[PDB]
Amino acid sequence: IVDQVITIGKHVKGYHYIIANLGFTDGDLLKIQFGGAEVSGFQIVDYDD
Amino acid sequence: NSIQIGGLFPRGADQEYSAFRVGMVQFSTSEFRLTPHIDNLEVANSFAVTNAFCSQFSRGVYAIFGFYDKKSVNTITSFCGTLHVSFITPSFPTDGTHPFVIQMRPDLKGALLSLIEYYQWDKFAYLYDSDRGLSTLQAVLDSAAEKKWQVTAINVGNINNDKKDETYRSLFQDLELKKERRVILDCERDKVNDIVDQVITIGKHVKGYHYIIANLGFTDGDLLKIQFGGAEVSGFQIVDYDDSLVSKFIERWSTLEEKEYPGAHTATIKYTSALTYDAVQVMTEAFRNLRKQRIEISRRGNAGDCLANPAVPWGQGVEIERALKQVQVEGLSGNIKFDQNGKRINYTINIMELKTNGPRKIGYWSEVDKMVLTEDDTSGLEQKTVVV
Amino acid sequence: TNAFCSQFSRGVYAIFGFYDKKSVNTITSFCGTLHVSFITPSFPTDGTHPFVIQMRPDLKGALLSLIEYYQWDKFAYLYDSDRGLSTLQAVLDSAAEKKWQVTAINVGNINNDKKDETYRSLFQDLELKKERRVILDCERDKVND
Numbered sequence: 222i223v224d225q226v227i228t229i230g231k232h233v234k235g236y237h238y239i240i241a242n243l244g245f246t247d248g249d250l251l252k253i254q255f256g257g258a259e260v261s262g263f264q265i266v267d268y269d270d
Numbered sequence: 271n272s273i274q275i276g277g278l279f280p281r282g283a284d285q286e287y288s289a290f291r292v293g294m295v296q297f298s299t300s301e302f303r304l305t306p307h308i309d310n311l312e313v314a315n316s317f318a319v320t321n322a323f324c325s326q327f328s329r330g331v332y333a334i335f336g337f338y339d340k341k342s343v344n345t346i347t348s349f350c351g352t353l354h355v356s357f358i359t360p361s362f363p364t365d366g367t368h369p370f371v372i373q374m375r376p377d378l379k380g381a382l383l384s385l386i387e388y389y390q391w392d393k394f395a396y397l398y399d400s401d402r403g404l405s406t407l408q409a410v411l412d413s414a415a416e417k418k419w420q421v422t423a424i425n426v427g428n429i430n431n432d433k434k435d436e437t438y439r440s441l442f443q444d445l446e447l448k449k450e451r452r453v454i455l456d457c458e459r460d461k462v463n464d465i466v467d468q469v470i471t472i473g474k475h476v477k478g479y480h481y482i483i484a485n486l487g488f489t490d491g492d493l494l495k496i497q498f499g500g501a502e503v504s505g506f507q508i509v510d511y512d513d514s515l516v517s518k519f520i521e522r523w524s525t526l527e528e529k530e531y532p533g534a535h536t537a538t539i540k541y542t543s544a545l546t547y548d549a550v551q552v553m554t555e556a557f558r559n560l561r562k563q564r565i566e567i568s569r570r571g572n573a574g575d576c577l578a579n580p581a582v583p584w585g586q587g588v589e590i591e592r593a594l595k596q597v598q599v600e601g602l603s604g605n606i607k608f609d610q611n612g613k614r615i616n617y618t619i620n621i622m623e624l625k626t627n628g629p630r631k632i633g634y635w636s637e638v639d640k641m642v643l644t645e646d647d648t649s650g651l652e653q654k655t656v657v658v
Numbered sequence: 659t660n661a662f663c664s665q666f667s668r669g670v671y672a673i674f675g676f677y678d679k680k681s682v683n684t685i686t687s688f689c690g691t692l693h694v695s696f697i698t699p700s701f702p703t704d705g706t707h708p709f710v711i712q713m714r715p716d717l718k719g720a721l722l723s724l725i726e727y728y729q730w731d732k733f734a735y736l737y738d739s740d741r742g743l744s745t746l747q748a749v750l751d752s753a754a755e756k757k758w759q760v761t762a763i764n765v766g767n768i769n770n771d772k773k774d775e776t777y778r779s780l781f782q783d784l785e786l787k788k789e790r791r792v793i794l795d796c797e798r799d800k801v802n803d
């Protein structure tokens with residue numbers, strides 16, 4: 222989905238995505254990271270512990 | 271009849287050489303055979319190019335086919351002019367009138383300026399690469415004075431590639447001060463993909479932006495990425511895949527073994543490679559028009575050292591030039607014709623636009639007719655005025 | 659190329675001369691390969707070419723500084739391609755950052771056996787925007803013209 226989103230260009234400022242899983246950093250975000258659209262999610266594995 | 275010629279191929283020109291080989295086969299006749307002496311050197315290095323030239327000259331060649339860079343171009347044009355040696359090249363056209371040089375690449379400068387006026391642009395960004403000379407840069411800058419344009423020229427060439435990201439972010443930061451939405455990419459097939467990729471990342475490929483790929487290979491690069499983005503993309507295509515001539519070439523090209531012919535198992539071909547193939551045809555028709563004209567030019571491999579002083583030009587070279595320049599056949603890059611200098615004339619460059627279904631020719635550009643649109647659309651859409 | 663190889667066969671320890679925007683690459687290349695030192699008053703090389711001593715300091719810096727001093731935002735830049743577009747790229751690149759409206763015009767390729775209807779058509783474009791601030795980047799000769 223993220224790949225398709227970037228292709229159609231719906232990853233720019235104005236869009237807001239929420240990844241409904243416990244692995245937010247488990248996927249590749251470097252792609253929709255500089256797009257502009259805000260992306261939120263959930264992380265269960267705190268790498269700060 | 272064995273005609274020895276030189277071949278200067280820059281390391282990495284796989285498809286170009288593959289196309290060079292296919293040409294040798296397709297245009298091989300019993301009347302005479304061409305003997306290519308291939309030399310793979312760093313085209314950029316002026317010194318190396320000098321040796322490769324004098325080496326092929328001592329071997330006693332009748333003509334030389336190769337490439338040059340913005341740095342080594344002066345070496346070639348100079349030596350070939352002094353030693354009366356003919357040099358055929360698909361590389362960018364020389365900025366001037368240099369004799370004994372045959373250029374396969376047509377001048378895009380004209381087609382570009384015409385396209386700008388078509389879209390009626392008054393303020394646009396011009397990202398250029400100093401690799402093919404600032405010949406086109408000067409073109410748009412000089413025209414910016416007459417046509418009154420606000421051009422934002424930016425050298426996207428000297429960007430160091432081992433950290434080239436904080437540079438692109440700072441690049442489109444300046445292209446946002448004036449809210450630039452219309453960009454012209456004057457780069458190679460490679461530097462274009464890099465920019466296109468960055469454009470998609472920052473999301474500047476959506477509706478509202480308009481890009482123009484300033485090269486003769488619009489379909490040579492990957493467009494599937496910025497195809498569904500929304501931003502309109504235009505460019506230029508020299509290899510018309512709609513010609514039965516080119517269509518037949520691909521039928522055999524796409525099937526060739528990629529093992530023996532590197533990067534040759536595709537349905538498309540880089541314009542640089544296509545010109546290489548057309549170059550072989552020009553050299554064949556040229557040496558053929560000399561046999562039928564009863565002109566003796568033959569010699570041996572004892573032309574001597576090129577640095578010979580005083581340097582004496584062999585008169586047989588003057589005829590070889592008048593032959594190549596007189597050639598006029600049909601190739602992948604449309605009608606091939608030349609003037610007294612070597613610059614191509616009476617050619618056609620198709621103007622391309624990228625739609626949802628893919629690239630589509632919206633017209634062509636003639637050196638004598640400028641831009642001419644081909645009505646391949648269903649116009650009159652939502653224009654029917656209400657009768658009150 | 660001959661003059662270089664000739665002086666090289668004569669066995670010299672160093673070479674002093676000049677180069678043009680066309681022959682510059684020949685010198686920088688040979689002198690780098692043959693480890694021969696080349697001293698020249700000509701324009702500085704656009705890069706880092708070893709075995710080359712350049713007497714002429716880089717003006718690119720001094721020019722850009724002067725522009726800011728007079729606080730210029732819109733000016734015409736008449737250049738000559740003889741000494742390379744090194745300074746042209748300088749003002750163009752800085753025009754992006756400092757936000758300038760530069761009107762670059764190649765006053766070099768002007769054929770001299772009829773160069774009058776060209777100058778009249780030159781200052782005709784420099785009047786559309788009423789340009790009153792011009793930068794002449796040319797040789798001592800092209801400047802007097």
Ligand SMILES: *[C@@H]1O[C@H](CO)[C@@H](O[C@@H]2O[C@H](CO)[C@@H](O[C@@H]3O[C@H](CO)[C@@H](O)[C@H](O[C@@H]4O[C@H](CO)[C@@H](O)[C@H](O)[C@@H]4O)[C@@H]3O)[C@H](O)[C@H]2NC(C)=O)[C@H](O)[C@H]1NC(C)=O
Nearest residue numbers: 598599600601603604605606607608615616617618636638
């Ligand atoms: C500038 O560039 C133009 C575009 O390439 C070019 O136009 C071509 O001109 C040639 C010569 O007239 C055209 O060749 C003819 O096409 C027709 C129709 O398909 C053929 O019937 C004809 O066959 C001929 O058959 C004759 C039989 O008697 C024979 O005598 C002839 O030798 C020949 O074989 C030709 O094939 C060609 O189609 C044109 N190209 C285009 C428009 O696609 C111009 O010539 C050129 N201008 C100049 C002055 O050079």
